[PDB]
Amino acid sequence: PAALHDRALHLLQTIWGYPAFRGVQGEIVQQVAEGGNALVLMPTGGGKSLCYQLPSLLRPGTGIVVSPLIALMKDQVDTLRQNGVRAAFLNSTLLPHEAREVEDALLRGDLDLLYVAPERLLMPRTLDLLERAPVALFAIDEAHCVSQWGHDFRPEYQQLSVLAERFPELPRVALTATADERTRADIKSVLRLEDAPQFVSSFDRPNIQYRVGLKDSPKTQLLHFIREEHPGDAGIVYCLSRKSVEETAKWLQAQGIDALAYHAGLSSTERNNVQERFLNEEGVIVCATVAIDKPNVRFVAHLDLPKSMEGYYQETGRAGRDGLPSTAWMVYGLSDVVNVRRMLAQSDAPEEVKRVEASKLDALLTYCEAATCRRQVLLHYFGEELSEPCGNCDVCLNPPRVRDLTREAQMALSATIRTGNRFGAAHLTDVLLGRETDKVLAQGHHQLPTFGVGKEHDEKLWRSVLRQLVSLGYLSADDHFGLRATGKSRGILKEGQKLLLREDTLLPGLEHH
Ligand SMILES: Nc1ncnc2c1ncn2[C@@H]1O[C@H](COP(=O)(O)OP(=O)(O)O)[C@@H](O)[C@H]1O
Ligand SMILES: [Zn+2]
């Protein structure tokens, strides 16, 4: 009721000292407290931990928490108990007499929370014992580890699928900081969360302004940006190679801005040197690769595209941990993107991994190539949905020049619907062009009314119109990289909504060498 909500608040105040719920917490709490399942996505420091702790206390019985991290579980228990919350940890390095003092406290219903290493949890009899205990809920922390594409991975987290089969009646909560569009499908498979609500909260950072542009002579381009907009300011400037980092630094010092290289082949010495000369003093600039601390950074500059949307989110987020406005500045070139693809084409990685890695690359480029608000594109990749344009990005503020492909979009959307939402971008494009592949013949797709219906255009165009549909969320990729129309597809199909491309991409043509 509202009498549940009131109840939770009096807990929020009296225990964690927090005044009010951040982002979607209060929904999650009331969702789980009432018996519901949940997927929770929040960035690090976002406030996950009490998403499960608060329901544990509101429901009769004990919240059961699983995380791979033992040392942090020990600390999270301690702090909980000093704050007046009855918590315990159980793992197999406890003396057997301790493991029983805790096991019996569970069964008597004496614990608000019990933190359990997956090692112990997965053991039947830890399983069986739980069925005899007054359990309020399960919380699978670091929930992403269930996924091979998951940031981290463990055999043991795949096995937590047991929780849903052995305890279907009881609420299950998964929380992870880092999830792409599907590592998430795996979380949802494994833990049987596919019908549960999904919550994302803290990903946005409203005080950072995002800008992307192409590269012609980037050093001057950067130098000019610092210059006008951040002369006495601290900033990070990111490059792929160790080589670029040191040129960029030598060069920036040659123009007498105070700049320093930072990277793994700096002797220890110099690393700590650069570190506090950057932290202590204001208006100093670090040139880093992928590598730490700083409160007030004004600008992050990317002289290269990162290898993922994740990396880019991380590095730009180093700006502005003051609520005070900051800018993220990036310049890329298609030249580069082509190199990344061939360097990943010639690799020795498995074909399953190349498809996924090229996936991340497309998402990254398409993010660059946005004809619509950049903050929506960025946030969508992590599952956050921003209703309206931010007014804080380079697309919002200085709208680029766009071409209207809304009718082409409809052809693409309808092609994939009518083909049963399972087929991939290369394949679909074969359809709208009219190409009869020996793989197009296998599905009889050539006999459909949507075949060659897009013949007016070429491959490069459909592939990009495809990329955009995915990126804006009009398309979703199921497997194995095959594409679904979404609930959002209707916007383009009822219309009222358009699919734009940057006039920037298209250009008078043809390319030449
Ligand atoms: N509802 C809230 N309102 C204000 N501050 C919060 C709120 N929830 C969490 N925080 C803060 O930010 C931190 C979140 O980190 P924690 O919840 O401890 O683990 P995680 O990094 O997984 O979220 C908290 O410890 C607390 O300092
Ligand atoms: Zn915007």
Residue numbers in the entry: 5 to 295, 300 to 521
Text taken from the publication that reported this structure:
RecQ helicases are a family of DNA strand-separating enzymes conserved from bacteria to humans that play a crucial role in the maintenance of genome stability. To better understand the structural and functional relationships of DrRecQ, we present crystal structures of the minimal helicase catalytic core from DrRecQ and its binary complex with ADP.
The apoenzyme structure was subsequently used to solve the binary complex structure with ADP at resolution of 2.90 Å. The nucleotide-binding pocket surrounded by conserved motifs is located at the D1 domain. Although we initially tried to model ATP into the experiment map, the γ-phosphate cannot fit well, suggesting that the ATP has been hydrolyzed to ADP during crystallization despite not adding a magnesium ion. ADP is bound with extensive interactions with the protein. The adenine moiety is sandwiched between Arg26 and Tyr22. The N6 and N7 atoms of the adenine ring are hydrogen-bonded to the side chain of Gln29, and the N6 atom is also situated within hydrogen-bonding distance of the main chain carbonyl oxygen atoms of Ala24. The ribosyl moiety is anchored via hydrogen bonds with the C-2 hydroxyl group of the side chain of Tyr22. Surprisingly, superposition of the apoenzyme against the binary complex reveals that the WH domain is positioned at a different orientation in these two structures, indicating the flexibility of the WH domain interdomain. The distinct domain orientation also indicates the interdomain flexibility of the WH domain. This motion generates a closed conformation in the binary complex structure and slightly enlarges the cleft between Zn-binding and WH domains in the apoform structure.
